[PDB]
Amino acid sequence: PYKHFMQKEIFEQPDSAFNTMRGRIDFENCVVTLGGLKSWLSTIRRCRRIIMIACGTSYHSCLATRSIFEELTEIPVSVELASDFLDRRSPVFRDDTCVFVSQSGETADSILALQYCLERGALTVGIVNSVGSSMSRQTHCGVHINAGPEIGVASTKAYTSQYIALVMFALSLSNDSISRKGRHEEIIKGLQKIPEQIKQVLKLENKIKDLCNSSQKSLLLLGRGYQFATALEGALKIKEISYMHSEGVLAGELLPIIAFATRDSLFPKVMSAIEQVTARDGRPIVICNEGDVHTTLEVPETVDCLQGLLNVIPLQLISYWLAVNRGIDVD
Amino acid sequence: PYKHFMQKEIFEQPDSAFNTMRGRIDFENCVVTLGGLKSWLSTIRRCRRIIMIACGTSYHSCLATRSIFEELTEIPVSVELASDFLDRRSPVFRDDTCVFVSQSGETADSILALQYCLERGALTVGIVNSVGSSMSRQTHCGVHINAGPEIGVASTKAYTSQYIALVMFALSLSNDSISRKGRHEEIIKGLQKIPEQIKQVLKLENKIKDLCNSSQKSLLLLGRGYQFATALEGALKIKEISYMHSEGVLAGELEDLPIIAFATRDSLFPKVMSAIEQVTARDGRPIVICNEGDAIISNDKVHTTLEVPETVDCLQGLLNVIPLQLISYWLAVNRGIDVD
Amino acid sequence: PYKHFMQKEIFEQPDSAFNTMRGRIDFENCVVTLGGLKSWLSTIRRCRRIIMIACGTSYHSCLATRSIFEELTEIPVSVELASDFLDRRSPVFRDDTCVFVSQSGETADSILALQYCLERGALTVGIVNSVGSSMSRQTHCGVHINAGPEIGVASTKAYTSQYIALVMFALSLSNDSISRKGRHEEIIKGLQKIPEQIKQVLKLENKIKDLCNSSQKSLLLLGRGYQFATALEGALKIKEISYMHSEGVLAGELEDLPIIAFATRDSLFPKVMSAIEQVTARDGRPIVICNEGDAIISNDKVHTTLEVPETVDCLQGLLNVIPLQLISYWLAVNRGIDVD
Amino acid sequence: PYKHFMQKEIFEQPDSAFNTMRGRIDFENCVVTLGGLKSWLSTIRRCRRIIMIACGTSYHSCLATRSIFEELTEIPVSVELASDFLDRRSPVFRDDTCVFVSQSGETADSILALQYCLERGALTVGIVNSVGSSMSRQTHCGVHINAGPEIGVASTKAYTSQYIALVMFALSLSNDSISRKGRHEEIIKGLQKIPEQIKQVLKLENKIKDLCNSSQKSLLLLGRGYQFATALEGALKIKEISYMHSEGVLAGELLPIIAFATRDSLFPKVMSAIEQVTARDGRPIVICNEGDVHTTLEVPETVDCLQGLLNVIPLQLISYWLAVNRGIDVD
Numbered sequence A, D: 001p002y003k004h005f006m007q008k009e010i011f012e013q014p015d016s017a018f019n020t021m022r023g024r025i026d027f028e029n030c031v032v033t034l035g036g037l038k039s040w041l042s043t044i045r046r047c048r049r050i051i052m053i054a055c056g057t058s059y060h061s062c063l064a065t066r067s068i069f070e071e072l073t074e075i076p077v078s079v080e081l082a083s084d085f086l087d088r089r090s091p092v093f094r095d096d097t098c099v100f101v102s103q104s105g106e107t108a109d110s111i112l113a114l115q116y117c118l119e120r121g122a123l124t125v126g127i128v129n130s131v132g133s134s135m136s137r138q139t140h141c142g143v144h145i146n147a148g149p150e151i152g153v154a155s156t157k158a159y160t161s162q163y164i165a166l167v168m169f170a171l172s173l174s175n176d177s178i179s180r181k182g183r184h185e186e187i188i189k190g191l192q193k194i195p196e197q198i199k200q201v202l203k204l205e206n207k208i209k210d211l212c213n214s215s216q217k218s219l220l221l222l223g224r225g226y227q228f229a230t231a232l233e234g235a236l237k238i239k240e241i242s243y244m245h246s247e248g249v250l251a252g253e254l255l256p257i258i259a260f261a262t263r264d265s266l267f268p269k270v271m272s273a274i275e276q277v278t279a280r281d282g283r284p285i286v287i288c289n290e291g292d293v294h295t296t297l298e299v300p301e302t303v304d305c306l307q308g309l310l311n312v313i314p315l316q317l318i319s320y321w322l323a324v325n326r327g328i329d330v331d
Numbered sequence B, C: 001p002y003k004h005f006m007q008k009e010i011f012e013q014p015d016s017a018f019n020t021m022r023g024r025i026d027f028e029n030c031v032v033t034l035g036g037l038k039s040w041l042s043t044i045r046r047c048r049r050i051i052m053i054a055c056g057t058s059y060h061s062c063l064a065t066r067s068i069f070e071e072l073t074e075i076p077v078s079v080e081l082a083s084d085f086l087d088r089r090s091p092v093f094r095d096d097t098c099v100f101v102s103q104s105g106e107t108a109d110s111i112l113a114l115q116y117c118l119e120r121g122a123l124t125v126g127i128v129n130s131v132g133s134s135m136s137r138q139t140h141c142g143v144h145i146n147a148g149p150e151i152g153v154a155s156t157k158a159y160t161s162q163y164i165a166l167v168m169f170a171l172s173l174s175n176d177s178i179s180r181k182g183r184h185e186e187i188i189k190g191l192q193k194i195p196e197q198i199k200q201v202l203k204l205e206n207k208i209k210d211l212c213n214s215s216q217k218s219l220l221l222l223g224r225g226y227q228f229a230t231a232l233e234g235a236l237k238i239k240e241i242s243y244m245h246s247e248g249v250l251a252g253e254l255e256d257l258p259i260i261a262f263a264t265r266d267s268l269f270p271k272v273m274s275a276i277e278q279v280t281a282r283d284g285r286p287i288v289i290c291n292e293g294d295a296i297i298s299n300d301k302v303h304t305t306l307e308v309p310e311t312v313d314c315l316q317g318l319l320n321v322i323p324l325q326l327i328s329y330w331l332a333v334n335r336g337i338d339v340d
């Protein structure tokens, strides 16, 4: 029913999303349960800093979750791209926890970093889609993102799944706080919804195809805060997928312009950023939540730290359709 | 005797830079004296981590030094964007040390963060040029890069001085390590060489002029390693000053316009090489900033080459950046635009 | 209606104790409110370690709670002697939290340490009874056990209140843990039972009197576990008040005099048992402080038995200690000595 | 030439002392080199706290060195008696380093703690006299105190050796500081001397025997600060060895009275403590350094943190001679 293995597994995303969660997340009393680390959480809760080492899309899932990780656990969280992390030979110690987010679980510069980390005493955690990958083997432990065999060039379904995992992670770390308890369920009750919210984004597919007639070599993702990671990812996409040139940037430190203005990332600074383009007159594309010279794509409103999950879909849909329109093997 | 103020203060650098070190560093016996911190140092030494909070160019000085703070001190160092950091509401604590870096001292978002960090118990440090700045009042302690009064519309000299500052900051903290004195005296000496070395790069002004006639709409700077800050820096200079578009990218990550490329020996990796290959293979001419006497392109291919002195790796950025100011200035002149 | 002030304030305890908790703890919904710390708490939570600095009896309240602070908070807790700590010049830092415990607030060595810790950047907390005390001024924050004005020559009520204090201190810090609410509500409830339970022990005054006629020159108190603070406490009471000699020892470590022995169920280990055996085997009579209804000695052997209510383990010490005050008082009376 | 295996190896102490040091300590440029941890120091220098778990004499070596350890490394150092440490079930984590000082390397409550520690994630370090003892086996690493087979009931030679090891340890941790560099050599140059300084204490042996005619069931060790550990050890001795009753206590928080008044531990508080007994009139025994109703035993003056090493010898000598005079198997 879909002409590309990239396209099916963009739509796979309602399921891939829930598979990520099934069993591990308990929605009625709110207990997330990652047996993958039942053995090491104790240690992590009490650890110096958590360092995120990842690549391509996996790097963007780290950005996208950093924010909520940190709030949820109060720990120095930081996100390092493995290629770089190596060049810089960051010092790392025994108190440190090193979380590696992989789809493949085979990425070279990751594995290198993993080794470096390992031989340097740090504790290691894999966040891997793949079964019995290298990473899987060498890590002290780590979650299996439990998505479904990814088979398109692009890390489409993988992304959102990782994102969810990463969250479930942050929750399970932080599961012994009465003060967070409120915000714990919120997110969880909201996670339950995420999968069907995914389907309702996949209806804009029609309006998105539509939008692919006025576009021409370029595109800018205009994000801030939570929806920053989404901007950069959307950017990675267009490039990686459509062999056009996108560049995600942070709203207004300052011509087809995607600008996320979902409520979770609606700053005056994003505001004036758009207001500033509307006066220039080039039609920007405004992603945001139902009921708010341009065009605007709706996305149902979720708990802000899950908001990134939805907003990225239109991004995949566009990028896919930008490569259909150019007759390119998307697989 | 220059046509713009901003052009002036670029050549102010082999001087602003000297004064930034002047009397704060001893070259005979290789120690570094930063008065302001004098009563907070051993404190900063024993601390959990360092968050550097900054804006525009100040963010980049922090990036360029980030690698080296870590190296010297082994304190975890995070570089943060003033505006952004705030939006996140990152949890901050007593054990924390928050270096605030400003040329001005009055940047709005920088301040709310200084207040924020202050509100939450953290130790606050202020690295500024400006005198009386809101910052330097409310910061627990701090330093004045002390480079002069900047009259150009963006941070040229300030960047480099800030840089220098941050580095002496990084040296101060690591002064009690015997297995470092080697690379300490490595760094401090090469520091002393900096200003004159700036001068050989300023001579490179002519070549840079002529380049601007073969460059227009958007520019790719390319960097990895130490020179990955300078990439986003030139990207910013170009972006702000010359009112073109630019973007620095991490090299070897993944039609026919300019390509600045940094192949100084601190930042030469295979991926920086491949980076070039495919560009020289798409038969397009890059501009290769790199050390005097370097066959970076099998020379049969067309490409300019800007030529820079070779210094201590973590210092190189201070040089690599000048040609990119010089570039970002003349383009703005050529484009008619008043660089003040 | 008592013959000495000190005797008075012992029976003041089921009251001084109530006031120490009074309005600072909610029994319906099991949370604990300590005003003073209110703006320093989440800070104390995220901190490296806790050094408790104290003298005489105040040192012992800190010991008795040390086990339980750790348990509740998982912050590393070190108990230190004011005088000694100073002599060592222990290195202290910003991340540090230094609980100073005083009944008086003006103990000389306690102060120099508060200054010392202050001089060196550490967070300083003041747990005192006294109002206006030098301490409570200069401490960053702190609490008043708020137990009353102590007119006896040594710390009876104060100890127990201090204790209580420290515990509520320990509860406050661990209030945000869901896997603790169980033992929290365990502790807070048993706290509410404390004062009356004091009363059953004060009834034990008669028995204690008669004991003093079968006891003289030097006394061995014996303890391990929770009750190892109470050991050195009675050792001190006896030492100071009754002007005998005493010494508490950790039980089961390795001619014919008195032996106090604590066999309450918090502090019952094999080594506490063997401890007894060999003493009951040397055919000498111990005095076994322990819970009502306990065959601690196969009863055929001669030995008194003081009888104490059974409470939450970390609280037990508050009870076990009274009989030892009662002892240390009457001996001093009998010995003629003016206990004020 | 000595009538007891306890007595020989009290005198063995010049040699046992230097054997502890040979090769590992380099006296001319001042490098202490413990290959036993060449593999873990990196980690220890950077670790949360160091916890000392020991027994009998081994506990007292920890006290005796705590002081200089802490000054030399600035780390939370703490000394826990294993029996207790267990009862209290102290929480302990991955950042933590746990140093176990054993002569035997077989002590039960130690081994237990070691296990506890281990199964709780902490890093473990043995400080063991014995070759291939249990401790030896289970530790991440640890020094071999390299004394000589101890064969008397008492931990005589063992003590001082441990003490030295413990120091060499603290040094090697702290070996990368320019500010300490001064105080580093001082101690080292002073360590060189320690062994012969030992011999000159062993001449008081004559005067000590002598002193064992006025003594009678008791004895108090009166120490403060550095010489506190020595007081408690001297106390352990008399009891353990002579089946008399000693009780080491800290100077003056207030009748044959040993009071250490070596220069390293000469406080006004020790002062008034003695001055206070001289007025009572009972002849106290004053240990101190050559040239300063009582009796007084000389002990050459060493670098204060090594001072404890000497002062303990007269203590052994007395305790030995208190058990010769009572016709007790000292072996």
Ligand SMILES: O=P(O)(O)OC[C@H]1O[C@H](O)[C@H](O)[C@@H](O)[C@@H]1O
Binding pocket: A054, A055, A056, A057, A058, A101, A102, A103, A104, A105, A106, A107, A110, A153, A154, A155, A240
């Ligand atoms: O997602 P992996 O398997 O860890 O690899 C990371 C990245 O590796 C490369 O950068 C690819 O271009 C991406 O598809 C991918 O995001």
Ligand SMILES: O=P(O)(O)OC[C@H]1O[C@H](O)[C@H](O)[C@@H](O)[C@@H]1O
Binding pocket: B054, B055, B056, B057, B058, B059, B101, B102, B103, B104, B105, B106, B107, B110, B154, B155, B240
């Ligand atoms: O923090 P400072 O000293 O005011 O300067 C840093 C930046 O401040 C602002 O954010 C400017 O827009 C930037 O162009 C500038 O580089």
Ligand SMILES: O=P(O)(O)OC[C@H]1O[C@H](O)[C@H](O)[C@@H](O)[C@@H]1O
Binding pocket: C054, C055, C056, C057, C058, C059, C101, C102, C103, C104, C105, C106, C107, C110, C154, C155, C240
């Ligand atoms: O610290 P505080 O409140 O003055 O009281 C503790 C001790 O202070 C002094 O050191 C007294 O000599 C002790 O007997 C007393 O117990």
Ligand SMILES: O=P(O)(O)OC[C@H]1O[C@H](O)[C@H](O)[C@@H](O)[C@@H]1O
Binding pocket: D054, D055, D056, D057, D058, D101, D102, D103, D104, D105, D106, D107, D110, D153, D154, D155, D240
């Ligand atoms: O010194 P070890 O072998 O670790 O055992 C510790 C102690 O064990 C017991 O307590 C002995 O009585 C002592 O001889 C010894 O000091």
Ligand SMILES: [Cl-]
Binding pocket: A034, A035, A036, A037, A142, A143, A144
């Ligand atoms: Cl899992």
Ligand SMILES: [Cl-]
Binding pocket: B033, B034, B035, B036, B037, B142, B143, B144
């Ligand atoms: Cl300065």
Ligand SMILES: [Cl-]
Binding pocket: C033, C034, C035, C036, C037, C142, C143, C144
């Ligand atoms: Cl209060």
Ligand SMILES: [Cl-]
Binding pocket: D034, D035, D036, D037, D142, D143, D144
């Ligand atoms: Cl060794």
